[PDB]
Coordinates of N, CA, C and O and ligand atoms in Angstrom, one line a residue:
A1 N 0.8 -1.2 0.1 CA 0.0 0.0 -0.1 C 0.9 1.2 -0.1 O 0.4 2.3 -0.7
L2 N 2.1 1.6 0.5 CA 2.7 2.4 0.5 C 4.3 2.2 -0.1 O 4.2 1.0 -0.2
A3 N 4.8 3.4 -0.8 CA 6.2 3.1 -1.7 C 7.1 2.7 -0.6 O 7.0 3.2 0.6
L4 N 7.9 1.9 -1.1 CA 9.2 1.4 -0.4 C 9.8 2.5 0.1 O 10.7 2.3 1.5
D5 N 10.0 3.5 -0.3 CA 11.0 4.6 0.3 C 10.0 5.5 1.2 O 10.7 6.7 1.7
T6 N 8.8 5.3 1.7 CA 8.5 6.1 2.4 C 9.1 5.9 3.8 O 8.9 4.9 4.3
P7 N 9.7 7.2 4.4 CA 10.1 6.9 5.9 C 8.9 6.7 6.9 O 7.8 7.5 6.9
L8 N 8.9 6.1 7.9 CA 8.1 5.7 8.9 C 8.8 5.9 10.1 O 10.0 5.3 10.4
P9 N 8.3 7.0 11.3 CA 9.0 6.9 12.7 C 8.9 5.9 13.3 O 7.9 5.1 13.3
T10 N 9.9 5.7 14.5 CA 9.8 4.3 15.1 C 10.4 4.8 16.4 O 10.7 5.8 16.6
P11 N 10.4 4.0 17.5 CA 10.8 4.5 18.8 C 12.2 4.7 19.0 O 12.4 5.3 19.8
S12 N 13.3 4.0 18.0 CA 14.8 4.2 17.9 C 14.8 5.6 17.2 O 16.0 5.9 16.8
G13 N 13.8 5.9 16.1 CA 14.3 7.0 15.1 C 13.3 7.0 13.8 O 12.1 7.2 13.8
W14 N 13.7 6.3 13.2 CA 13.1 5.9 11.6 C 13.4 4.9 10.9 O 14.4 4.3 10.9
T15 N 12.4 4.4 10.0 CA 12.7 3.2 9.1 C 12.1 3.6 8.0 O 11.6 4.5 7.7
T16 N 12.1 2.6 6.7 CA 10.9 2.8 5.7 C 10.3 1.8 5.5 O 10.0 0.5 6.3
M17 N 9.0 1.7 4.7 CA 7.9 0.9 4.3 C 8.8 -0.7 3.9 O 8.2 -1.5 3.9
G18 N 9.8 -0.3 3.2 CA 10.8 -1.1 2.5 C 11.2 -2.0 3.4 O 11.5 -3.3 3.4
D19 N 11.8 -1.7 4.7 CA 12.7 -2.0 5.8 C 11.9 -2.6 6.7 O 12.4 -3.5 7.6
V20 N 10.9 -2.1 7.0 CA 10.2 -2.7 8.4 C 9.9 -4.1 8.4 O 9.0 -4.2 7.3
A21 N 9.8 -4.7 9.5 CA 9.6 -6.2 9.7 C 8.8 -6.5 10.5 O 8.2 -5.4 11.9
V22 N 7.7 -7.5 10.8 CA 6.7 -7.9 11.6 C 7.6 -7.8 13.0 O 8.8 -8.5 12.7
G23 N 6.9 -7.6 13.9 CA 7.6 -7.4 15.2 C 8.4 -6.2 15.5 O 8.5 -5.9 17.1
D24 N 9.0 -5.3 14.7 CA 9.0 -3.9 14.5 C 8.0 -3.4 15.2 O 7.2 -3.7 15.5
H25 N 8.4 -2.2 15.8 CA 7.5 -0.9 16.2 C 7.7 0.5 15.6 O 8.7 1.2 15.3
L26 N 6.3 0.8 15.0 CA 6.1 2.3 14.6 C 5.7 2.9 15.7 O 5.6 2.4 16.9
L27 N 5.1 4.3 15.5 CA 4.4 4.7 16.2 C 2.8 5.3 15.9 O 2.5 5.3 14.7
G28 N 2.0 5.0 16.9 CA 0.7 5.0 17.1 C 0.0 6.7 16.7 O 0.8 7.0 16.8
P29 N -1.2 6.5 17.2 CA -2.0 8.0 16.7 C -1.4 9.0 18.0 O -1.8 10.0 17.8
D30 N -1.2 8.3 19.1 CA -0.4 9.5 20.2 C 0.8 9.6 20.1 O 1.6 9.8 21.2
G31 N 1.6 8.9 19.1 CA 2.9 8.8 18.9 C 3.6 8.0 20.1 O 4.9 7.9 20.0
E32 N 2.9 6.8 20.6 CA 3.5 5.8 21.5 C 3.6 4.5 20.4 O 3.1 4.3 19.6
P33 N 4.9 3.8 20.8 CA 5.2 2.7 20.1 C 3.8 1.8 19.7 O 2.9 1.4 20.6
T34 N 3.5 1.1 18.5 CA 2.8 0.3 18.1 C 3.4 -0.8 17.4 O 3.9 -0.7 16.4
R35 N 2.9 -2.0 17.8 CA 3.5 -3.1 17.2 C 3.0 -3.4 15.8 O 1.6 -3.4 15.7
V36 N 4.1 -3.7 14.7 CA 3.8 -4.5 13.6 C 3.5 -5.8 13.6 O 4.5 -6.6 14.1
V37 N 2.4 -6.2 13.6 CA 1.6 -8.0 13.8 C 1.7 -8.5 12.1 O 1.4 -9.7 12.4
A38 N 1.7 -8.0 11.2 CA 1.5 -8.6 10.0 C 1.9 -7.6 8.8 O 1.8 -6.6 8.8
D39 N 2.4 -8.3 7.9 CA 2.8 -7.3 6.7 C 2.0 -7.8 5.3 O 1.5 -9.0 5.3
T40 N 2.5 -7.1 4.1 CA 2.6 -7.8 2.6 C 3.7 -7.8 2.2 O 4.9 -7.5 2.8
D41 N 4.0 -9.0 1.2 CA 5.2 -9.1 0.3 C 5.2 -7.5 -0.2 O 4.2 -6.4 -0.4
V42 N 6.3 -7.3 -1.0 CA 6.4 -6.0 -1.9 C 5.7 -6.4 -3.1 O 5.7 -7.5 -3.7
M43 N 4.7 -5.4 -3.5 CA 3.8 -5.8 -4.6 C 4.2 -5.0 -5.8 O 4.5 -3.8 -5.7
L44 N 3.7 -5.5 -6.7 CA 4.2 -4.6 -8.3 C 3.2 -4.2 -8.9 O 1.7 -5.3 -8.7
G45 N 3.0 -3.4 -9.8 CA 2.2 -3.1 -10.7 C 0.8 -2.7 -10.5 O -0.4 -2.4 -11.2
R46 N 0.7 -2.1 -8.9 CA -0.4 -1.5 -8.5 C -0.4 -0.2 -9.0 O 0.3 1.0 -9.3
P47 N -2.1 0.5 -9.1 CA -1.9 1.9 -9.5 C -1.5 3.0 -8.1 O -2.4 2.6 -7.3
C48 N -0.5 3.8 -8.8 CA 0.4 4.8 -7.5 C -0.5 5.5 -7.5 O -1.0 6.4 -8.7
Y49 N -0.3 6.8 -6.7 CA -0.8 8.0 -6.5 C 0.4 8.8 -5.6 O 1.2 8.0 -4.4
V50 N 0.4 10.2 -5.6 CA 1.0 11.1 -4.9 C 0.1 11.3 -4.1 O -1.0 12.3 -5.0
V51 N 0.1 11.6 -3.0 CA -0.8 12.7 -2.0 C -0.3 13.4 -1.3 O 1.2 13.2 -0.7
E52 N -0.4 15.1 -1.7 CA 0.6 15.9 -1.1 C -0.1 16.7 0.1 O -1.7 16.8 0.4
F53 N 0.7 17.2 1.1 CA -0.1 17.7 2.7 C 0.3 18.9 2.5 O 1.5 19.8 2.0
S54 N -0.7 19.4 3.6 CA -0.2 20.9 4.0 C 1.0 21.5 4.6 O 1.5 22.7 4.7
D55 N 1.5 20.2 5.2 CA 2.4 20.3 6.2 C 3.8 20.4 5.0 O 5.2 20.4 5.8
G56 N 3.7 20.5 3.8 CA 4.8 20.3 3.0 C 5.2 18.7 2.7 O 6.6 19.0 2.2
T57 N 4.9 18.1 2.9 CA 5.2 16.5 2.9 C 4.5 15.7 1.9 O 3.3 16.4 1.4
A58 N 4.9 14.6 1.1 CA 4.3 13.9 0.4 C 4.2 12.4 0.6 O 5.4 12.2 0.9
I59 N 3.1 11.5 0.3 CA 3.4 9.9 0.6 C 3.0 9.5 -0.8 O 1.7 10.0 -1.3
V60 N 3.5 8.5 -1.4 CA 3.2 7.6 -2.5 C 2.6 6.3 -2.1 O 3.3 5.8 -1.2
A61 N 1.0 6.1 -2.1 CA 0.6 5.3 -2.0 C -0.4 4.1 -3.2 O -0.5 4.9 -4.0
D62 N -1.0 3.1 -2.9 CA -1.5 2.5 -4.0 C -2.9 3.2 -3.8 O -3.5 3.8 -2.7
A63 N -3.8 2.5 -4.8 CA -5.2 3.2 -4.6 C -5.9 3.0 -3.7 O -6.9 3.4 -3.3
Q64 N -5.6 1.6 -2.8 CA -6.9 1.0 -1.9 C -6.0 1.2 -0.5 O -6.7 0.9 0.2
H65 N -5.1 2.2 -0.5 CA -4.6 2.4 0.7 C -5.6 3.2 1.4 O -6.3 4.0 1.0
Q66 N -5.7 2.9 3.1 CA -6.7 3.7 3.5 C -6.3 4.8 4.4 O -5.2 5.1 5.1
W67 N -7.1 5.7 4.4 CA -6.8 7.2 5.3 C -7.9 7.4 6.3 O -9.0 7.3 5.7
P68 N -7.6 8.0 7.4 CA -8.5 8.4 8.4 C -8.9 10.0 8.2 O -8.2 10.5 8.7
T69 N -9.9 10.1 7.3 CA -10.3 11.7 7.4 C -11.7 12.1 8.2 O -12.4 11.1 9.2
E70 N -12.1 13.4 8.2 CA -12.7 13.7 8.9 C -14.3 13.0 8.4 O -15.6 12.8 9.1
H71 N -14.6 12.4 7.4 CA -15.7 11.8 6.9 C -15.6 10.5 7.1 O -16.6 9.7 6.5
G72 N -14.5 9.7 7.8 CA -14.3 8.5 8.0 C -13.1 8.0 7.2 O -12.2 8.3 6.5
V73 N -13.1 6.7 7.0 CA -11.9 6.1 6.0 C -12.2 6.3 4.7 O -13.5 6.1 4.7
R74 N -11.2 6.6 4.2 CA -11.2 6.7 2.4 C -10.1 6.2 1.8 O -9.1 6.1 2.6
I75 N -10.3 5.3 0.8 CA -9.1 5.1 0.2 C -8.3 5.9 -0.7 O -9.1 6.8 -1.2
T76 N -7.2 6.0 -1.1 CA -6.6 7.0 -1.8 C -7.2 7.3 -2.7 O -7.5 8.7 -3.3
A77 N -7.9 6.5 -3.7 CA -8.6 6.8 -5.0 C -9.9 7.8 -4.7 O -10.4 8.1 -5.8
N78 N -10.5 7.9 -3.7 CA -11.5 8.6 -3.1 C -11.0 9.8 -2.5 O -12.0 10.8 -2.0
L79 N -9.7 10.1 -2.2 CA -9.1 11.3 -1.3 C -9.4 12.4 -2.4 O -9.5 12.2 -3.5
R80 N -9.7 13.7 -1.8 CA -9.9 14.8 -2.2 C -9.4 16.1 -1.5 O -9.3 15.9 -0.3
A81 N -9.0 16.9 -2.3 CA -7.8 18.0 -1.7 C -9.1 18.8 -1.0 O -10.3 18.8 -1.4
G82 N -8.9 19.2 0.5 CA -9.5 19.6 1.2 C -9.6 18.9 2.3 O -10.0 19.3 3.4
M83 N -9.5 17.4 2.3 CA -9.9 16.7 3.4 C -8.6 16.7 4.2 O -7.5 17.2 3.9
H84 N -8.7 16.2 5.6 CA -7.9 16.3 6.4 C -7.9 14.6 6.8 O -8.8 14.1 6.5
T85 N -6.3 14.2 7.6 CA -6.1 13.3 8.0 C -6.0 13.1 9.6 O -5.0 13.9 9.7
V86 N -7.1 12.5 10.2 CA -7.1 12.9 11.6 C -7.2 11.6 12.4 O -7.2 10.3 12.0
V87 N -7.0 11.8 13.7 CA -6.9 10.7 14.7 C -8.0 10.3 15.4 O -8.1 9.6 16.0
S88 N -8.9 11.4 15.5 CA -10.1 11.2 16.3 C -11.4 12.1 15.6 O -12.0 12.9 16.4
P101 N -3.5 20.6 15.0 CA -3.8 21.0 13.9 C -3.8 20.0 12.7 O -2.5 19.6 12.3
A102 N -4.9 19.4 12.2 CA -4.9 18.3 11.5 C -4.4 18.7 10.2 O -4.8 19.8 9.5
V103 N -3.4 17.8 9.6 CA -2.9 17.9 8.5 C -3.8 17.9 7.4 O -5.0 17.3 7.3
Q104 N -3.7 18.9 6.2 CA -4.6 18.9 5.3 C -4.0 18.4 3.7 O -3.0 18.5 3.6
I105 N -4.8 17.5 3.2 CA -4.6 17.3 1.5 C -4.8 18.3 0.9 O -5.8 19.0 0.9
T106 N -3.7 18.7 0.1 CA -3.8 19.4 -0.9 C -3.8 19.2 -1.9 O -4.2 19.8 -3.3
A107 N -3.3 18.1 -2.5 CA -3.5 17.7 -3.7 C -3.7 16.1 -3.8 O -2.8 15.3 -3.3
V108 N -4.1 15.4 -5.1 CA -4.1 13.7 -5.1 C -4.0 13.9 -6.6 O -4.5 14.1 -7.2
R109 N -2.7 13.0 -7.1 CA -2.9 12.7 -8.7 C -1.9 11.4 -8.5 O -1.4 10.8 -7.9
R110 N -2.3 10.5 -9.7 CA -2.0 9.3 -10.2 C -0.4 9.7 -10.8 O 0.3 11.0 -10.9
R111 N 0.2 8.6 -10.3 CA 1.6 8.6 -10.7 C 2.1 7.2 -11.0 O 1.3 6.1 -10.7
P112 N 3.2 7.1 -12.0 CA 3.4 5.4 -12.5 C 3.6 4.7 -11.6 O 4.5 5.0 -10.1
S113 N 3.7 3.5 -11.9 CA 3.7 2.6 -10.4 C 4.6 2.1 -10.3 O 5.9 2.1 -10.9
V114 N 4.8 2.1 -8.7 CA 6.4 2.0 -7.8 C 6.0 0.7 -7.0 O 4.6 0.1 -6.8
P115 N 7.0 -0.1 -6.4 CA 6.5 -1.3 -5.6 C 6.2 -0.6 -4.3 O 6.5 0.5 -3.8
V116 N 4.9 -1.4 -3.6 CA 4.3 -1.0 -2.8 C 4.2 -2.1 -1.8 O 4.6 -3.4 -2.0
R117 N 3.8 -1.5 -0.4 CA 3.9 -2.7 1.0 C 3.2 -2.1 1.9 O 3.1 -0.8 1.8
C118 N 2.4 -3.3 2.5 CA 1.5 -2.6 3.7 C 1.7 -3.3 5.0 O 2.5 -4.4 5.0
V119 N 1.3 -2.8 6.1 CA 1.7 -3.4 7.3 C 0.6 -2.9 8.1 O -0.4 -2.3 8.0
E120 N 0.2 -4.2 9.3 CA -0.6 -3.8 10.3 C -0.5 -3.6 11.5 O 0.9 -4.5 11.9
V121 N -0.7 -2.9 12.4 CA -0.6 -2.7 13.8 C -1.3 -2.9 14.9 O -2.8 -2.8 14.4
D122 N -1.2 -3.1 15.8 CA -2.2 -3.5 17.0 C -2.9 -2.5 17.9 O -3.3 -2.9 18.7
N123 N -2.9 -1.3 17.3 CA -3.4 -0.3 18.7 C -4.7 -0.3 18.2 O -5.3 -0.4 16.9
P124 N -5.8 0.2 18.8 CA -7.3 -0.1 18.7 C -7.6 0.8 17.5 O -8.7 0.7 17.2
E125 N -7.2 2.1 17.4 CA -7.5 2.8 15.8 C -6.9 2.2 14.7 O -7.3 2.8 13.6
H126 N -5.9 1.2 14.7 CA -5.1 0.6 13.8 C -4.5 1.6 12.6 O -4.5 1.6 11.3
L127 N -3.8 2.8 13.2 CA -3.3 3.8 12.5 C -1.7 3.6 13.1 O -1.3 3.7 14.3
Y128 N -0.8 4.3 12.2 CA 0.3 4.8 12.3 C 0.9 5.9 11.9 O 0.0 6.5 10.7
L129 N 2.0 6.5 12.1 CA 2.4 7.7 11.4 C 3.2 7.5 10.5 O 4.3 6.6 9.9
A130 N 3.5 8.3 9.2 CA 3.8 7.5 8.1 C 4.5 9.1 7.7 O 3.9 10.1 7.4
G131 N 5.7 9.1 6.7 CA 6.1 10.4 6.2 C 6.9 11.2 7.1 O 6.8 11.4 8.5
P132 N 7.7 12.1 6.4 CA 8.4 13.1 7.3 C 7.9 14.0 8.2 O 8.0 14.3 9.3
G133 N 6.4 14.3 7.8 CA 5.3 14.9 8.8 C 4.8 14.3 9.5 O 3.9 14.5 10.6
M134 N 4.9 12.8 9.6 CA 4.2 11.8 10.8 C 2.8 12.1 10.9 O 2.3 12.3 11.6
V135 N 2.2 12.1 9.5 CA 0.9 12.2 9.0 C -0.1 10.6 9.4 O 0.5 9.6 9.2
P136 N -1.0 10.8 10.3 CA -1.8 9.6 10.5 C -2.2 8.9 9.0 O -2.7 9.2 8.5
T137 N -2.2 7.6 9.3 CA -2.5 6.7 8.3 C -3.1 5.4 9.0 O -3.0 4.9 9.7
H138 N -3.7 4.6 7.9 CA -4.6 3.5 8.5 C -3.9 2.3 7.8 O -3.9 2.1 6.8
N139 N -4.0 0.7 8.8 CA -3.3 0.0 8.1 C -4.2 -0.8 7.0 O -5.6 -0.8 7.2
Ligands
LIG201 ZN1 12.8 12.8 14.3
LIG202 ZN1 -7.2 3.1 -9.0
LIG203 ZN1 -0.1 -0.5 5.6

């Protein structure tokens, strides 16, 4: 679901979607450690998107990656500029467009909101 070079914060610092392993820890919606309990392989040929955010950061995700918005969970293919990514000043999505397919990968974490922080801006996203 996210491009492999997407940086993700960790209790020790930073990793990437390409490097993070089951049993590692990411950061949950409150910034506390949250365990990775499942993943996907690296997946090829999925339709990819760039999501640009108001904090000056951007994340490449596939069409079906899920995002927590004020309207509820939306997949990337349904994001619209103006929406925000929230955990319950929320960062705003400023643009969404298709981009050529790159390798992507998803992970699942075990906090009750099923959210982890992603990108250099530490934006909330859904597993
Ligand atoms: Zn840092
Ligand atoms: Zn699509
Ligand atoms: Zn994921």
